[PDB]
Amino acid sequence: SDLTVAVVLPLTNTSYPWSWARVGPAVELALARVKARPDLLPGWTVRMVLGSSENAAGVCSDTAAPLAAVDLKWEHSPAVFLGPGCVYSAAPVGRFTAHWRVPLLTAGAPALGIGVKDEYALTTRTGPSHVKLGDFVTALHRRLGWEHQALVLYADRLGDDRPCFFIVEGLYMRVRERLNITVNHQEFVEGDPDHYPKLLRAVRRKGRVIYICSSPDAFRNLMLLALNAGLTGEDYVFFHLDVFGQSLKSAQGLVPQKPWERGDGQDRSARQAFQAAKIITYKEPDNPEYLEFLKQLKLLADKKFNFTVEDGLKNIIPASFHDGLLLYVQAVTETLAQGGTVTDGENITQRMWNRSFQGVTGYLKIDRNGDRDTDFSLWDMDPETGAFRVVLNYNGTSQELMAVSEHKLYWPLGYPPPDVPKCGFD
Amino acid sequence: SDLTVAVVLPLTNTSYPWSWARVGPAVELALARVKARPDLLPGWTVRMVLGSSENAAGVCSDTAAPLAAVDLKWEHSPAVFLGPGCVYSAAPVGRFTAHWRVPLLTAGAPALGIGVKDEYALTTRTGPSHVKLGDFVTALHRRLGWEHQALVLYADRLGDDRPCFFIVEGLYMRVRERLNITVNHQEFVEGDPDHYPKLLRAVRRKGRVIYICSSPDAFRNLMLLALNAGLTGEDYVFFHLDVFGQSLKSAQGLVPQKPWERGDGQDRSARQAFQAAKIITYKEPDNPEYLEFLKQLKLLADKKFNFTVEDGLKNIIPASFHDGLLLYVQAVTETLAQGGTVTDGENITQRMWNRSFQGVTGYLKIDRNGDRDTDFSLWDMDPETGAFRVVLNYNGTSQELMAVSEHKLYWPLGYPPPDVPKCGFD
């Protein structure tokens, strides 16, 4: 007669894309639409019990989250879990919910190992996955003749969820799975100046197609040093793995988009450096349902959550929680519609998997593995104005690169530089 | 009026040094000795509640173990936890028990990160630690002039607890913490023949002081290939990181000790190869209390556990569970003796820490960090007979290398070869 949804997310800390101050109202929106739909669970009153994934210091915890999962499981016996979004929170909760035979839904947890559904059974990911970033990088190399060597530099803050590590792991494993080219990798520490001579040396010794997962300022400083050392777009290309567009403003206003602009008198130098730089991000959803969702999300979060949802790519995480929830409610109704129950975890999950769906994020496809296909944009600068704009788009379901607004990929030599230099790297 | 001890160990699988078929009777011995002592918890009837750390397949689990921990915690509210011994079981349970403010005791969990007691608070390790292996390797290098470079090769079986990884991690981090020499490392897969050309090439390119953590047969095959390729004790030394002496028989009988012997017609070749090879193991306890303990352990396990405890270094793990338990019971009795309670986790733990104790394993010292100092033996072959015997012993508390039975370390050149070759590695 009613459905119990257990939530394990950051209830107090509002810094995460999957924080409750932002996912909560998007879930409220999805529940309110379930009510207004007589074709989605008619009569059931879907209730929600919350559990915080964060520890005493307020960051997402490999301990608070699985404890919260056990506490909600015995106190309310839910039929589905929502979250966590942090990798180290989601991995133990995922293994618990797999053992409990309870489906798990999250728009976070993008790490490679969550993809092993043999272990994380009944885990359905409706947000991005880092293997999908490897799909995009694969298609990018195939469409640009780079079939030999790439270099990946990544850095994390000690004690975080290691987002750049997992980003690089997904890219690394999938790209070598599909292309079998040599992917060199090097970890650094952003605040440690000793690493920058080492990085610049490895940049000019280990690759010419160079991916960097770092903060905007680290990526900027690395570019400044690369120009100062004579590394230009004729030989090198530096992709910034900035999936949430942290180095960019929102796609709503703030025209134009300048990541090299900082106001430290280095901006003129940074722009010439950034001529060799391109930014890989998630794709902003186009459909008008998304913009209307943003308006209602902003209203409802400022209302019943005392939080101000600003514009940006991070809002695709609450939008995907929303969409995943509706995708789940429909699957339950279909299972009920054939004699099943709300606890038929495997039946419900398989109705969700290998399935296309229409939600506020537009067309979203769950693959055979239970993971949402992820679309990516490629940003490039206009050599006239210097501002960055989308020039390439990747459809994760079809794995096709489509040019955007008749733009071209800027190259100082007229075509992309080779992934291997003239007479070897020496 | 009674003490509740929660146990999370392998209750059914009897393959682990910390399996219950082996730890259970050692703990029953320790409890029966608490009864017979009027100075240890007089009147308290110490009860035990068990929980299996193993999953459905019967191997120790990062999921079954923390679930078992939560289940014993709410069902019995114990005052102390015993186990797990596996790293991936012990890390989540450790974080739970730290959060619950309940002391944790184990002779397993030797990984580097368990030593961060800031996180794994009130975790006391009474068995070996892999950082202690690094102390031994440090002392070995200081006493032999190797102060430049070493190479570490290690391999694991996919899906195990990664024992060789954690062994190498402890050796690597502690040794570079104290010597700051270049420690090269390489992982391989024992069953994959592709790696053996790669290893042999790295052996003669990355080091001459070479530590290998692998199975006996892999270490043996690696030695045979090193002789076949002309790598002898005049230039190279190969340490086998075989801490449980899997490549050797027990110290009780089976005279003499021949790890190169296999019965495949390669034994004559293997002996010449093994002239360059020395084996690092835990030290067999000497004291006669240990031998009497072994007799009572064998009797009690064959009695109330239907298990046959054979001789070997692995028995120091149940012996240390036994000793740690008594060390804990005394600490509780001391806490009770000053008005404390059995739940003063911090008070009890600090009485146990930075403290020497006399147990069936003889003299055992808990360091300031809560970890038992670990003694190591170094096995070498007699060039006359070819059999291996202890020639060096490392006291972990005093960090001293003492020669054993007036033996000398065998060197084909009369002294150890340099950790760096003649005119560089080229």
Partner: peptide, 25 residues
């Protein structure tokens, strides 16, 4: 498989890298 990537998701396995190419640790 990989020497650096694919090895579980517990902070216990990220205390040194040791398979990885890192300047820290």
């Amino acid at each position: 498989r990989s020497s650096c990537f694919g090895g579980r998701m517990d902070r216990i396995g990220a205390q040194s890298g040791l398979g990885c190419n890192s300047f820290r640790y």
